[PDB]
């Protein structure tokens, strides 16, 4: 399990793996981490596969009475605002909950990380799961704010083939979500071997 | 003292095709080193298009597959129509994250075709998570037969082998074969087996046998 | 795993089932486990494996260098003496749940042994995980001084029992035959468990693999 | 873990903390942002558990602005003090406590400059200086050292760059940046960011 | 389980019953629980297995060594003090209900008990085992001083009747033994 | 029930043709003594329907009083329907199992018996809630001991008559004498058909020794 | 378990005249991988190699010990060994620690050497021994390796089905299994010649 | 302790030892075990003491308002109803060894049984207490069908006699009682 | 030992006027089962000390057998040489100490009465080594009920006699067989003087109980 | 706790501890030494419970020496990382084990340069690369994106800046400066002493 986000001048991307494995057992290869909230939210799975989508399709529930409701669309920080909210009700009861809250907002691009320990806080960069360091160290390597944007697209992609080359934990396809002004779009869904024969020379 | 959960086992598989949903699942109910019973299928059928299948503790299979069949007929009930598949798996992952603190330890897959009329397998876990997938294998046994399916119906992990639609037949010998072969290793698999069908023209049941120890 | 023992009208009838589990995977189906002690006394073992297997290689090379100092047919006794006091020497930290048969001047004298050093001199016995089902199928149908393919039958009956309860074997119940005389010993005795033919061909073909690096030694 | 001082002066209260926000491994956030301006001459810290400084800046810092809504005017910093100290007497003995460490600056039209001191057991003190963490250990001497009732600003600036080139020596945390707050008869005024390049 | 020894004016009588389980299940219904050492002196056992068999070969090897170097026939009081000093020695791992009886030429019939800590004590009569608690409930109801051989024999036949009809690990047969100046009388009842 | 005191031990039942027998013992154990050697431990349900159960014995003296409440209430609604035995096996399951749910398990291990309109029923109910249909069942150690016995002979002959099914738990109850130590010399037989339903005395064993002769 | 501490897969299959061995290639603490090219299967005298897996530690230090053992028994007699005479040695080695045990399964592949027979077994932590005709496996993953050998296995294979068999059961087994990966190596070896191959995995 | 009901043709005869013990000092020396409840209904109790009082007195307090509102004399069986509600539906934390027995104008005297679990069986003759086993041994072996009065005082005196002598807990001093048609009737017994 | 199987009970010891007394019962109960109901709890050592213990009995029969030989063996010097009871006080001491250092105790609580040489002498050896001197010693539950009644007539009267001490002892018995679980009514009396040791037959105690007339 | 880099080269190893001392709280001593001069072409690190390396440093270095002054010439790499492995996987079962941490660094005339890698419990590895610590997972992504088997030493050193100035960013430890030897052709070659001014 390895997830990142970092946002610059054009946007968000949002890249992560697709393995979730079951302790030494792996699961399946094409679990699709990043949960789809809106057309303006992109939620990702960052420890414990139940507790993440659950919670994320109750925070999409919440949103879409909130938009409803006010004929406005919700902005990041009260998402977020929300989804800790909603979390810190079972606090010891063994919720294990590390996700990422990316979207577009009346400021521009938000960028928010909640914990089910309730660290909501702002940022530029974050990196959640088991290798999370290796998409840090090689992140903050390439990491710029006036970046392009196919620039960014090999940032996080040989960011996550670092990672999962590391780590034992994380593998399968590699997606890759880019938000902008009006919505996210979708990039690619890379596969590790197709990255190890185009990225090994 | 009194543990709340115990290990029955079984193995319950599903394969999804063009325009078909195959669930199969061993009867065997055993309990540590004793035989329960010889007839106790994983199966069952929902509606005309809908078959389930629950391993694992066998009490809460029961409770949970008689709950769904209330919420089934309550949908039914209120709003002239049937449910999909993937509002029934909905539903499902809504009622294991409601017993979250204190779990389901069952396995669950469900098959069945979808409003386009294809095949679909939603598999599960014990907390409350699914995913639309082609083909899953739950129990005791999913480790023996996953890495199979990955060669036959992924068509994995080889080269110069083209992709064929997975037809019928095919289909029905791939699960007679993946059965027998699963048999000869585990401790909680065998002595029949009860191949569930979903078509567009109905569900149609198969008795196989297996061999008797 | 259940192991069986009994006395007929000479000697005596020894059954086994050959699945030798590792955890809760099948590892073997067919592991032998009627061990050789002597031309005619002969044991089983039950429970943790290599600890059953190096001690009655132990307890036969005993017996062998004694029979061979001596000059003479071994007995049972000084068996039944050796393995008591060595399992008692290790406190009961080995498990080895073992049969011991055979047949001496006096004649057939069966033993019993649990692995903390408790024997029983029994004219039946049944030992291993499901030893039940063979012992319900003694208790039901034994009755003193049988006679041969009487006691053979009644041997495989409750072995067979057993497999069919849980934790048998898918093996063909393994006999040996211990007699004043005559020592018989059947390894395919009856197969009931045909394997299912296969239904198609998962065969790979000549390339189907991708490979890196290669490489050819020669040899005499 | 990490550290906030809060040193008290004749006429201003010299608060600063520190920006880091790490999670046991990795430093998550370089920028963190532990203060909260209750009112116009009123400050706040927090550090403890790190779920929980948030809930009780909510709470503290909401129900403040309300009372300030509610009369026409602002707290005193004791009685409000004492109001964070009551609310975690309150949430102590329940089956949800709270683990945090705060202490209060704050400032008087006419009590003047007044600085208070939490523990995650609701003890109130009146202290001439405090800290929280592991560097308050080292830090709380040194500063002792070099100590007078009757200090000026920029004295208390320099003794802070003493006392942060201290840290930087004989710490085993990394700590790059402190962020610096001064309350004055104005309110709230914000210094500069102080870092140091150590080697 | 059930072990009893009584002893009479011309000799001693023994008795046990035999069903040595482990847990719930029986793993042997018949049992020597009784055990000759010499030919004249008997012990019975119970508690654990392994404990009182070893025990039991270790004296049996060193009483017969003792009284083959005296060329004359052992005592009783000599056998319940190698057993006293054998169970005494590893009370940290030994389970012994070693219970000594026997005639002998120079004292006659004699008992003498071993419970499980490792005490020596010369009994008229004695108990023994876990289902034993309730014959000792009425053992000094019942009792004559100065019986017969009969009279022991019919005893200790309600008695092991009775330990063997209420306590559920207790079952099986009654084995008993009748040691004099004459002969060794071992016989199976039932009823 | 965490701690059961006072148990039962093992419950033997098959069916045969147009019927099934069930026959239990009349032991009251607690520990290792057999404190209360007469006891019932089968309730014969109204007319139909049968029960027979191991484990602790006053959660079944307490489910005996429920379900006679419950079948009286029935009776008493006189409109010529009654509980089949399987809406009987249904409830007893759903209670068993809002029992464990609430970590207040009843320590039982119950068999439920019935023949009802050309069919023979027999089910089970353990205390965890699993529960199923068998045409021979066998708790506790039967499960171990006399279930490889109705298996060999269901396996040897599908069908049955009540004279072998009668002869077949005689011999099964007779080796439960032989070698549990928690049985005993008296069992009761209960038989229904459709003329009613009959419980038997207390029958006991006739057992052999005669290995007792050698060494 | 302290059995997947470092992970781990060896196989080995029995064919009609030929023996063919294969493990996985990763090394690295509980879910830190460190390199990809770890020796597992060692040499011991002439078309017969063993397999260990489990613990580095043990798997060096028994590769050694019995090096050292092996080494004395084939300088004290001229002939060269035979497999029952290795297994039975590699038997006593594990048994002499039998309260103090390695936390290895040795497996070993080897051909006859008068005729070309050839033998495949595997032991257990404490020394037990099992002699199949098929295949044996050990390692972390086991039900693995255990389906798709008893799905593919044929009983007269030429070399290069048997390679191919071998190649497709480990490429499968360690793409599902977590801790064990990062490549294959494979020995097939028969009475003319020895064969090495190394495979394609994913590096996932 | 020790605690004993015998019923005979026209009544009930019950038995108690006193010796009340916390750990190995005795608390009291003499004591009440038996406990009037109702005028021809008794209880013996034991196990813990504070437990069999409040359960005692709530019993008393629901069976006399039940018997003076059915304005006819109570059954004894309801009474061992009620004990088998109070004690099986509030188990857990009790530890009841309540014996009920008592004569009745319909159904003579009996004698109900309620052990620690909770069940309720009706018996011709009981035990109850830890050290009861030992005539527990022997009530099997001394009874016979069909006593008089004066057979049953004298069977559970020697019951008594030796529960006292045997287990240290138990001692103290005998109490009978004994129901009948006519009257109850009481008494103390010492050496 | 680290878990003492059959236990005896109180030990009781006073001086008087040229010999100690010393009184314990016979009862070797076994938990709360009295199994051995008449054993011998006072050793008489050769002419001057005595011995009398409590806890393990098998730990006492073994200092019996080490003490006998140890006696014997002076004895068989024939130097005229005796142990003192203040020698045997002091080895007994040193050999509990040395016991209970190994982490292996003996589990007793052991009296030593003895008069040489005009003076009397009383010693206390514990388990775990304390070891004093004293005009009156109590074990076990004696040291917290007869105790007081000791510390009371030696502090009413400074002396004694043969005859005070010995009804004394006979009331605290009774008083020890009122109120202790693990008492029995049996006992015997052991007293040395200068004309030897001797020891009584079993006496018994008489009892009242006129307040179980009372409510 | 810390981490010391040992690149390997085509014709060199690049090797680089640190100079911390610190016992959990304070850094005591920042101008240690974990760097073990085996022979002229042999160098050895070590990293563990801080009163087992001097120890191995003892029993290691001074059994080479004495090797060295026996037979008449320098032991290999390979055989001196054999020999610390069976010493490690001795000691280990007994009632004083060993925890440390080493990595291997040396030169042969014939092998050239070669790197191997241990564990505490007695692990082999001959690695391009290898790591231990926290720094392990930051150090390894950065080198394992950046590496080139015909690399020159330049760019080695260069690399190990750029990955040490990503080392001065995100963790929660101090680490202030770094020593940096060089194993070739002739020998140990010590390079500058490596720290940074941070901000």
């Not at chain 1, 659950?54 to 920080?77: D, G, T």
């Not at chain 1, 530029?124 to 620039?151: H, I, K, N, P, W």
Request: glycine fraction near 8%.
């Amino acid at each position: 399990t390895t997830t990142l986000a970092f946002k610059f001048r054009h946007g968000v991307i949002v890249a992560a793996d697709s393995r979730a494995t079951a302790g030494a057992y792996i699961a399946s290869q094409t679990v699709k981490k990043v949960i789809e909230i809106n057309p303006y939210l992109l939620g990702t799975m960052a420890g414990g596969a139940a507790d993440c989508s659950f919670w994320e399709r109750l925070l999409a529930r919440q949103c879409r009475i909130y938009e409803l409701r006010n004929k406005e669309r919700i902005s990041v920080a009260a998402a977020s605002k929300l989804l800790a909210n909603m979390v810190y009700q079972y606090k010891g009861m063994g919720l294990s909950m590390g996700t990422m809250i990316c979207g577009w907002d009346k400021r521009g691009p938000g960028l928010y990380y909640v914990d089910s320990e309730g660290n909501r806080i702002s940022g530029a960069t974050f990196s959640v799961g088991s290798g999370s360091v290796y998409a840090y160290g090689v992140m903050d390597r390439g990491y710029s704010y006036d970046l392009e944007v196919e620039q960014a697209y090999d940032l996080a992609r040989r960011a996550i083939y670092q990672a999962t080359y590391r780590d034992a934990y994380s593998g399968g396809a590699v997606n890759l979500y880019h938000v902008r002004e009006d919505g996210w779009i979708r990039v690619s869904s890379d596969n590790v071997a197709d990255l190890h024969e185009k990225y090994s020379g | 003292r009194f543990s709340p959960y115990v290990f029955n086992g079984g193995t319950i598989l599903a394969i999804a095709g063009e325009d078909f949903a195959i669930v199969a699942s061993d009867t065997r109910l055993s309990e540590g080193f004793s035989i329960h019973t010889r007839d106790s299928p994983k199966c069952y059928k929902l509606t005309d298009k809908t078959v389930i299948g629950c391993s694992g503790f066998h009490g809460d299979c029961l409770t949970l597959t008689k709950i769904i069949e209330a919420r089934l007929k309550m949908y039914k009930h209120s709003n002239n129509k049937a449910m999909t598949t993937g509002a029934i798996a909905a539903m499902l992952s809504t009622i294991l994250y409601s017993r979250r603190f204190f779990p389901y330890y069952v396995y669950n897959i469900i098959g069945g075709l979808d409003e386009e009329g294809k095949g679909a397998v939603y598999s599960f876990d014990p907390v409350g998570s699914y995913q639309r997938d082609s083909f899953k294998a739950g129990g005791s046994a999913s480790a023996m037969l996953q890495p199979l399916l990955d060669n036959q119906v992924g068509f994995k992990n080889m080269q110069n082998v083209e992709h064929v639609p997975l037809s019928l037949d095919r289909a029905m010998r791939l699960v007679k074969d993946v059965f027998i072969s699963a048999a000869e290793r585990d401790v909680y698999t065998g002595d029949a087996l009860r191949i569930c069908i979903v078509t567009k023209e109905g569900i149609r049941e198969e008795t196989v046998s297996l061999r008797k120890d | 795993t259940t192991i069986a023992g009994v006395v007929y009208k000479d000697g005596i009838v020894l059954g086994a089932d050959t699945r030798a589990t590792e955890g809760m995977v099948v590892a073997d189906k067919n592991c032998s486990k009627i061990h050789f002690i002597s031309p005619n006394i002969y044991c089983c073992g039950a429970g943790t494996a290599a600890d059953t297997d190096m001690t009655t290689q132990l307890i036969s090379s005993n017996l062998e260098l004694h029979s061979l100092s001596t000059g003479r047919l071994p007995r049972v006794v000084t068996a039944n003496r050796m393995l008591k006091q060595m399992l008692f020497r290790y406190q009961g930290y080995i498990g080895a749940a073992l049969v011991l048969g055979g047949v001496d001047v006096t004649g057939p004298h069966l033993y019993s042994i649990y692995p903390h050093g408790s024997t029983d001199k029994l004219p039946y016995v049944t030992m291993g995980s499901g030893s039940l089902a063979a012992m319900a199928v003694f208790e039901d149908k034994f009755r003193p001084d049988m006679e041969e393919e009487e006691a053979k039958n009644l041997v495989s009956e409750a072995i067979a029992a057993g497999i069919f309860n849980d934790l048998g074997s898918g093996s063909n119940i393994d006999l040996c035959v211990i007699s004043k005389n005559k020592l018989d010993f059947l390894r395919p005795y009856t197969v009931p468990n045909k394997k299912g033919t296969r239904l198609g061909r998962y065969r790979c073909e000549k390339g189907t693999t991708a490979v890196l690096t290669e490489k050819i030694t020669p040899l005499e | 873990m990490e550290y906030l001082i809060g040193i008290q002066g004749p006429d201003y209260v010299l608060v600063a903390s520190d920006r880091v926000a790490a999670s046991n491994i990795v430093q998550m956030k370089d920028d963190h942002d532990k203060m909260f301006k209750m009112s116009e001459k009123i400050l706040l810290l927090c550090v403890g558990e790190a779920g929980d400084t948030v809930q009780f800046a909510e709470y503290i810092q909401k129900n403040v602005q309300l009372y300030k809504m509610r009369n026409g005017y602002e707290l005193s910093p004791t009685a409000a003090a004492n109001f964070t100290r009551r609310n975690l007497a309150d949430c102590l003995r329940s089956r949800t406590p709270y683990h945090v460490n705060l202490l209060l600056a704050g400032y008087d039209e006419h009590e003047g400059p007044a600085l208070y001191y939490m523990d995650y057991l609701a003890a109130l003190a009146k202290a001439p200086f405090a800290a929280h963490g592991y560097g308050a250990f080292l830090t709380l001497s040194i500063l002792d050292r070099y100590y007078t009732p009757t200090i000026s600003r920029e004295r208390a600036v320099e003794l802070l760059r003493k006392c942060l080139e201290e840290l930087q020596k004989r710490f085993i945390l990394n700590l790059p940046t402190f962020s610096v707050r001064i309350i004055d008869k104005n309110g709230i005024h914000d210094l500069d960011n102080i870092s140091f390049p150590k080697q | 389980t059930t072990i009893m020894a009584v002893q009479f004016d011309g000799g001693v009588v023994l008795g046990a019953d035999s069903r040595t389980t482990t847990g719930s299940y029986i793993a042997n219904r018949v049992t020597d629980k009784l055990t000759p050492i010499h030919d004249r002196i008997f012990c019975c056992r119970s508690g654990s297995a392994a404990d009182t068999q070893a025990v039991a070969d270790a004296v049996t090897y060193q009483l017969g060594f003792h009284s083959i170097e005296l060329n004359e026939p052992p005592l009783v009081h000599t056998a319940a003090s190698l057993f006293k000093e054998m169970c005494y020695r590893y009370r940290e791992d030994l389970m012994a209900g070693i219970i000594i009886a026997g005639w002998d030429p120079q004292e006659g019939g004699q008992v003498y008990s071993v419970p499980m800590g490792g005490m020596m004590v010369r009994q008229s009569f004695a108990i023994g085992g876990s289902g034993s608690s309730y014959i000792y409930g009425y053992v000094d109801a019942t009792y004559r001083e100065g019986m017969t051989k009969e009279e022991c024999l019919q005893f200790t036949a309600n008695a092991l009747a009775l330990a063997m009809e209420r306590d559920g690990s207790s079952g099986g047969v009654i084995r008993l033994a009748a040691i004099a100046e004459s002969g060794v009388e071992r016989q199976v009842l039932l009823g | 029930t965490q701690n059961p005191m006072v148990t039962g031990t093992s419950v033997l039942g098959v069916k045969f043709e147009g019927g099934v027998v069930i026959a239990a013992d009349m032991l009251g154990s607690y520990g290792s003594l057999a404190r209360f050697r007469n006891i019932s431990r089968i309730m014969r349900v109204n007319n139909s329907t049968m029960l027979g159960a191991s484990g602790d014995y006053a959660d079944f003296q307490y489910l005996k009083q429920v379900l006679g409440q419950m079948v009286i209430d029935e009776e008493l609604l006189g409109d010529g329907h009654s509980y089949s035995p399987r809406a009987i096996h249904s409830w007893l399951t759903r209670a068993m199992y809002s029992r464990r749910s609430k970590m207040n398990p009843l320590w039982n291990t119950m068999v439920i018996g019935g023949y009802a309109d050309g069919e023979s029923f027999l089910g089970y109910v353990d205390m965890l809630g699993v529960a199923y249909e068998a045409p021979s069942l066998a708790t506790g150690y039967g499960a171990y001991l006399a279930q490889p016995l109705l298996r060999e002979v269901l396996e040897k002959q599908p069908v049955l008559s009540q004279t072998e099914a009668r002869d077949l738990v005689e011999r099964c109850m007779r080796v439960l004498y032989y070698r549990d130590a928690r049985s005993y010399n008296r069992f009761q037989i209960a038989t229904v058909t459709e003329k009613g339903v009959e419980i038997e005395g207390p029958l006991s064993t006739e057992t052999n020794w005669d290995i007792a002769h050698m060494i | 378990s302290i059995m997947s501490y470092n992970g781990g897969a060896v196989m080995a299959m029995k064919g009609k005249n030929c023996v063919a061995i294969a493990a996985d290639r990763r090394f690295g603490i509980q879910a830190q991988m460190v390199t990809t090219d770890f020796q597992k299967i060692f040499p011991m005298g002439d078309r017969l190699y063993i397999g260990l897996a489990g613990l580095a530690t043990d798997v060096q230090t028994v590769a050694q010990r019995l090096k050292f053992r092996l080494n004395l028994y084939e300088l004290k007699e001229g002939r060269q060994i035979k497999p029952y005479t290795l297994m039975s040695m590699v038997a006593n080695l594990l048994y002499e620690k039998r309260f103090g045990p390695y936390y290895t399964e040795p497996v070993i592949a080897g051909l006859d050497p008068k005729t070309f027979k050839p033998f495949i077994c595997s032991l257990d932590l404490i020394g037990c021994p099992m002699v199949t005709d098929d295949f044996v496996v050990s390692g972390t993953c086991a039900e693995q390796m255990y389906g798709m050998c008893e799905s593919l296995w044929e009983p007269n294979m030429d070399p290069d089905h048997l390679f191919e068999t071998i190649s497709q059961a480990m490429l499968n087994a360690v793409d599902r299994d977590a801790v064990s990966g990062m490549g294959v190596i494979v020995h097939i070896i028969e009475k003319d010649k020895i064969t090495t191959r190394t495979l394609k995995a994913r590096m996932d």
